[PDB]
Design a protein around this ligand. Sequence first.
Ligand SMILES: C=CC[C@@H]1/C=C(\C)C[C@H](C)C[C@H](OC)[C@H]2O[C@@](O)(C(=O)C(=O)N3CCCC[C@H]3C(=O)O[C@H](/C(C)=C/[C@@H]3CC[C@@H](O)[C@H](OC)C3)[C@H](C)[C@@H](O)CC1=O)[C@H](C)C[C@@H]2OC
Ligand SMILES: C=CC[C@@H]1/C=C(\C)C[C@H](C)C[C@H](OC)[C@H]2O[C@@](O)(C(=O)C(=O)N3CCCC[C@H]3C(=O)O[C@H](/C(C)=C/[C@@H]3CC[C@@H](O)[C@H](OC)C3)[C@H](C)[C@@H](O)CC1=O)[C@H](C)C[C@@H]2OC
Lengths: 107, 107
Amino acid sequence: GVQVETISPGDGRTFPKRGQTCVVHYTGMLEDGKKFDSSRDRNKPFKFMLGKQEVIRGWEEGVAQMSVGQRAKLTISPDYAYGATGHPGIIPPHATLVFDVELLKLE
Amino acid sequence: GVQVETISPGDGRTFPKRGQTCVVHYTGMLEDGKKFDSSRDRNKPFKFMLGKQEVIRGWEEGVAQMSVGQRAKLTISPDYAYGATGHPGIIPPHATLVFDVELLKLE
Ligand SMILES: C=CC[C@@H]1/C=C(\C)C[C@H](C)C[C@H](OC)[C@H]2O[C@@](O)(C(=O)C(=O)N3CCCC[C@H]3C(=O)O[C@H](/C(C)=C/[C@@H]3CC[C@@H](O)[C@H](OC)C3)[C@H](C)[C@@H](O)CC1=O)[C@H](C)C[C@@H]2OC
Ligand SMILES: C=CC[C@@H]1/C=C(\C)C[C@H](C)C[C@H](OC)[C@H]2O[C@@](O)(C(=O)C(=O)N3CCCC[C@H]3C(=O)O[C@H](/C(C)=C/[C@@H]3CC[C@@H](O)[C@H](OC)C3)[C@H](C)[C@@H](O)CC1=O)[C@H](C)C[C@@H]2OC
């Protein structure tokens, strides 16, 4: 599934609802910390909506547990990410992924 | 994983090697037989290579067990396909997929 470990607390009040746009900054890394992607490096937040199969399930269920302003590490098992296939040229088969996610706002 | 059940036998001699192009016709369906895609409908075989994360793992391991001319049903568990996420707008979360695959040739 997904484990959510908090780096900095959110407002403890505003949690994402299906049909809102979540605006986040993320860094994705393998379990040993190797970075494969980050929106912080592009200086451009990533936006997505819950309920539309727009993100891997680990994100759909991890970000729904965060409130605005929170920064958390989401550790996602392979079945909630790219499974036995991986993602071509970036993520190996059976990889647990770690995302450092900051939920900046909801629109 | 993947289960391979044969509809028509292949030559029992020529099995796909990494670095060959497999030329196939396929029909993909959910477990109840609902069709979501077929190359047969486009009259255009699908081609791919083993060893390059070009296909879901269930195909990488299922087609490697088929010889040329064989037609088989590959039943693939979600972790060897799209897992808990599914494929946006086409495949639901946690879906076992069934592919009717004919291995036409290797190039
Ligand atoms: C339409 C095509 C381009 C479109 C691309 C963008 C909007 C740019 C957006 C910043 C993606 C990044 O581009 C630099 C890059 O992000 C990664 O590096 C990454 O960190 C990651 O894992 N992310 C991104 C952050 C949200 C979680 C997760 C995701 O959910 O990503 C989603 C993902 C790949 C889901 C697949 C969908 C197919 C399902 O079958 C499968 O289910 C198993 C899961 C992305 C958002 C797709 O919905 C949308 C796209 O693909 C991937 C390693 C590869 C991906 O490039 C493609
Ligand atoms: C570059 C972009 C376009 C590029 C599209 C084509 C060459 C056209 C090709 C006929 C695809 C079909 O287009 C009508 C259509 O085929 C399906 O309908 C389908 O029957 C299927 O399941 N197939 C196709 C037959 C081989 C097995 C499997 C697959 O392995 O498909 C692969 C797949 C989606 C793998 C993801 C890759 C990301 C990993 O993270 C994830 O790992 C969990 C698995 C396809 C071949 C990709 O490698 C290449 C592409 O995407 C999918 C339901 C959705 C897919 O449309 C996209």
